[PDB]
Design a protein around this ligand. Structure first.
Ligand code: NGT
Length: 635
């Protein structure tokens, strides 16, 4: 079997037999992107909190039988890109997050956790499954804790959410061991140089089995109680039926035991509630100033995919959820809505830090895959391992008059599946901007800007940078006019005049001198970097496995050696006279679900190539290999 699959264990004995590398799809299942650092920028919303956090508990993956752990040949996906508002992403469906989610989260500076789920049950079988997890060696260590930590290290993820819903007589006396399991895990993770965090559901009490407090209280505080420095649960997920009094209690309890109240995440039941249609007791969790007094736990926000029919609808619905109905993260909840956008209440963060930042707005899925503005893969995909860094703000706009509509464009892109489009009927002379990214990028004599764009007929368009933390765009050396045309162009600008300064934000600015019917401008790629070099080509590239369906269709797995300058890799086949992209991945082992030849294909072999796409946005020279069909298409 070539297709990589989610990792699932039928028993604790099976987990105890786990060893690094002992599964045929391990090379693909490992995360490949190290967890990025993030900056917390200046607040842009007067009601936002830098203390309040958001944890998402999401069913991230297809449920289709025989779906791949890396994605698939379908556009519709939980192509999450609102990482800027998340503390963490919980992979709800299983113990071991898939590489497509680990990679996307890590590139965006967000930790990803597996889920250790004990069934809502009092069956002896379930009670025993729970007790069995807490088996100890003579020295008091927990062998299952070691395997959890070992897996987190090997596959490259950040810890676990524990949902302990099993109850009954055998469960009740096990609070102490469960607490010690979590503390021991920390000791062991430190020992193996791979720290992990635990998030803990408000379910199993210390002494009385399952009982939801809807908060932190007298029956569950032990799970958050510190051992000086160390803690058992890092994060606590409060059950959904909180209120003012329960929240007051939670805060009192956290403070008393010496924990930050914001480590308590007040649950929102978004599955039964319908995503942003969920009734929340906002008045019970907002203080006198309209600011959050606890964190927010998002239960099943993946539900939002049910609210639209298309993949384009997925992102628009996420906008309502994360930004708010008012459509601008600097604005307040409309008077005729109940839902607060996350951005209304929670400060954004940004992984766009250092001397290099690049993006082509790759959301990890598309209808097609574009290569320098030309269709290369002419069909749908989701491979979230390649997910990039989308705008911090969606959409922070100011205008002298009317505002252009900003949206993702899955019909035309520069690299990957979509660009950003800014469009509308312009009624008359107007100046306006769109503030896109919060950043902290150090400029040197070697720093350049590369910007790929298209359209803008009837306007002047500029990109401008703020060199202050409070996002003022008053620096004359930080404005660049774009040279517009009807086709994709990629322009480089010298940023050396800004050497020694720091860029804190990026915006577009539009001038229209009069009316323009169906104005459109696309932004396709943005790079700020002191590196203009092609990354080195991959080496030692080969087909390591294959399975022909027929003479025209095969699965394959390819492997190669990369380098530190590569952000991710693209694999292509030569289809007649044309190279066509198959897939992309952050990994150096890559599954090809369909290598294909037409009816007119000549010979018994077919060329494949792999290209490194740099952290600086530049492609390497290709490495090539030959796929051997062993037969002609007419044989
Ligand atoms: C964390 C949580 N664990 C439980 C889930 O397994 C259920 O599906 C959900 C039903 O609303 O309730 C709590 S939320």
């Amino acid at each position: 079997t070539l297709k990589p699959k989610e990792i699932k264990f039928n028993s604790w004995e099976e987990l105890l037999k786990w060893e690094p590398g002992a599964r045929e799809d391990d090379a693909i299942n490992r995360g490949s992107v190290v967890l990025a650092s993030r900056r917390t920028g200046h607040l842009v919303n007067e009601k936002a909190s830098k203390e309040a956090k958001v944890q998402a508990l999401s069913n991230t993956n297809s449920k289709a039988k025989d779906h791949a752990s890396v994605g698939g040949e379908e556009f519709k996906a939980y192509a999450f890109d609102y990482w800027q508002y998340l503390d963490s992403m919980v992979f709800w469906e299983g113990l071991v997050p898939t590489p497509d989610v680990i990679d996307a989260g890590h590139r965006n500076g967000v930790p990803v956790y597996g889920t250790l789920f004990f069934n809502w049950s009092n069956s002896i079988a379930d009670q025993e499954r729970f007790a069995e997890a807490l088996k100890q060696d003579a020295d008091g260590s927990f062998p299952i804790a070691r395997k959890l930590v070992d897996m987190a290290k090997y596959y490259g993820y950040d810890g676990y959410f524990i949902n302990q819903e099993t109850t009954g007589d055998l469960v009740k006396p096990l609070g102490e061991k469960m607490r010690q399991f979590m503390l021991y895990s920390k000791e062991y993770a430190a020992k193996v140089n791979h720290p992990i965090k635990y998030s803990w559901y408000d379910a199993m009490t210390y002494n009385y089995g399952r009982y939801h407090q809807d908060g932190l209280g007298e029956y569950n505080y032990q799970f958050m109680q510190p051992e000086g420095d160390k803690v058992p649960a890092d994060n606590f997920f409060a059950n959904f039926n909180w209120d003012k009094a329960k929240n007051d209690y939670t805060i009192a309890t956290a403070n008393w035991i010496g924990r930050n109240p914001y480590d308590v995440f007040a649950g929102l039941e978004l599955q039964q509630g319908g995503s942003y249609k969920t009734k929340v007791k906002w008045n019970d969790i907002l203080d006198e100033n309209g600011k959050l007094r606890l964190s927010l736990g998002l239960f099943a926000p993946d539900t939002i995919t049910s609210l639209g029919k298309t993949g384009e609808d997925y992102h628009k619905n996420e906008d309502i959820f994360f930004t708010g109905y008012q459509g601008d993260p600097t604005g307040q909840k409309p008077g005729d809505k109940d839902w607060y956008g996350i951005a209304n209440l929670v400060a954004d963060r940004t992984p766009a830090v250092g001397n290099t930042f690049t993006t082509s707005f790759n959301t990890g899925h598309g209808k097609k895959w574009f290569v320098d503005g030309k269709v290369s893969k002419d069909s749908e995909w989701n491979y979230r391992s390649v997910s990039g860094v989308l705008p911090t703000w969606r959409w922070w706009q100011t205008s002298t008059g009317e505002k252009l509509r900003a949206e993702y464009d899955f019909t035309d892109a520069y690299n990957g599946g979509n660009s950003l489009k800014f469009s509308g009927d312009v009624a008359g002379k107007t100046d306006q901007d769109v503030r896109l990214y919060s950043t902290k990028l150090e400029v040197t004599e070697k720093t350049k800007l590369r910007v790929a764009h298209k359209g803008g007929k009837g306007s002047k368009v500029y990109m401008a940078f703020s060199t202050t933390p409070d996002y003022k765009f008053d620096d004359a050396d930080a404005w660049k006019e774009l040279t517009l045309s009807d086709n994709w162009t990629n322009e480089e600008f010298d940023l050396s005049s800004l050497a020694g300064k720091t860029i804190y934000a990026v915006k577009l600015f539009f001038e229209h001198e009069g009316a323009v019917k169906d104005y459109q401008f696309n932004l396709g790629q943005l790079t700020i970097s002191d590196n203009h070099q092609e990354p080195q080509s991959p080496t030692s590239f080969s087909v390591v496995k294959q399975s022909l369906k027929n003479a025209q269709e095969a699965e394959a797995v390819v492997q190669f050696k990369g380098n530190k300058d590569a952000d991710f890799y693209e694999v292509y086949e030569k289809d007649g006279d044309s190279w066509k992209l198959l897939t992309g991945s952050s990994s150096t082992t890559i599954y090809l679900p369909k290598v294909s030849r037409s009816a007119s294909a000549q010979g018994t072999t077919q060329e494949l190539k792999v290209v490194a796409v740099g952290k600086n946005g530049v492609r390497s020279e290709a490495a090539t290999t030959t796929f051997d069909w062993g037969m002609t298409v007419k044989d």
